[PDB]
Amino acid sequence: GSMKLAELTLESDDFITSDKLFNFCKSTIFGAKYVKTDFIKFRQYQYIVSNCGWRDDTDVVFLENTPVLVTGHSDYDISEREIDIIRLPNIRAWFCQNRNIPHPKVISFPLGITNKDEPNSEIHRIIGNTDRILEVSKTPKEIKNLVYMNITVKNFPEERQRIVDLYSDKSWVTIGKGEVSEEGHRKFLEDMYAHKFCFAPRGNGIDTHRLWESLYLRTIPIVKKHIAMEQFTDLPILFVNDWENITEEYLNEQYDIIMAKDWNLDKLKIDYWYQKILEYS
Ligand SMILES: [Ca+2]
Ligand SMILES: [Ca+2]
Ligand SMILES: [Mg+2]
Ligand SMILES: [Mg+2]
Ligand SMILES: [Mg+2]
Ligand SMILES: [Mg+2]
Ligand SMILES: [Mg+2]
Ligand SMILES: [Mg+2]
């Protein structure tokens, strides 16, 4: 229920991944179609799309006869470009990654954790290991420092270059050195677990894995305000107007407030989103 971030407890099957939602939608009894966002953005017909063999899905989708649409597995957003699909009266709900239009019919869902089962990707297999996240979350949370910073600036520099430039040299920041390996993943999670805060700026897409990775480890992610994030304001996320003038005093106060407040942490659990889709069946 409504509870404190510190009180969060996870089971092995709780973690949100887009594969779990995609798999959920394969059972057509639940009356929901999952399409990779690319096939919406680059549609060759206004109201007809297909996964074109993505996840071995060759079905042609007729959106005029689709009651619930679900899009993800893409850093692409849902924006004004898709307004003609959104205005279809037969569509009761559009569940999407990267909601970027202020329309009440479009419902954000968390990017969550990397899809471990991405076929020939060793990187997806390593970072997608939710067991390792679960294991670390059950160890004693021993705070080593205020904020964890482990950021590849390339993914979206206008924000990420400022974070590295402004805060790399702060005593209250620990710089993380990402090693893409089974040992490296464990070390990364342990580091992040031992901080009150993690920097979770947007990347190529608005939503990032770091945001969700942080919340499962009961570490507070820091994220720039965006319409894409506006339905997650009942999660203990530190939303910032910009990246300038973060201090030890500012973060210590935000820590005391966020940890004192009660949050809808059920939204971190895949079951929430299964039931939310079933609600529009
Ligand atoms: Ca301000
Ligand atoms: Ca500021
Ligand atoms: Mg649980
Ligand atoms: Mg899981
Ligand atoms: Mg992109
Ligand atoms: Mg509009
Ligand atoms: Mg590290
Ligand atoms: Mg800024």
Numbering used by the authors: -1 to 279
Text of the article:
Protein A075L is a β‐xylosyltransferase that participates in producing the core of the N‐glycans found in VP54, the major viral capsid protein of Paramecium bursaria chlorella virus‐1 (PBCV‐1).
To address the enzymatic mechanism, we solved the 3D structure of A075L in its apo form as well as in its complexes with the donor 1 and the trisaccharide 6 acceptor. The structural analysis of these structures revealed that A075L adopts a GT‐B fold, comprising two Rossman‐like domains. In contrast to its earlier classification as an exostosin (PF03016) within the GT47 family (Speciale et al. 2019), we show that the region spanning from V66 to K222 does not constitute an independent domain. Instead, this region comprises the β‐sheet of the N‐terminal Rossmann domain and several helices at the C‐terminal domain, as shown in Figure S3e. Despite several attempts to co‐crystalize A075L with both the acceptor and the donor molecules simultaneously, none were successful. Despite extensive screening, only crystals with an empty active site or no crystals at all were obtained.
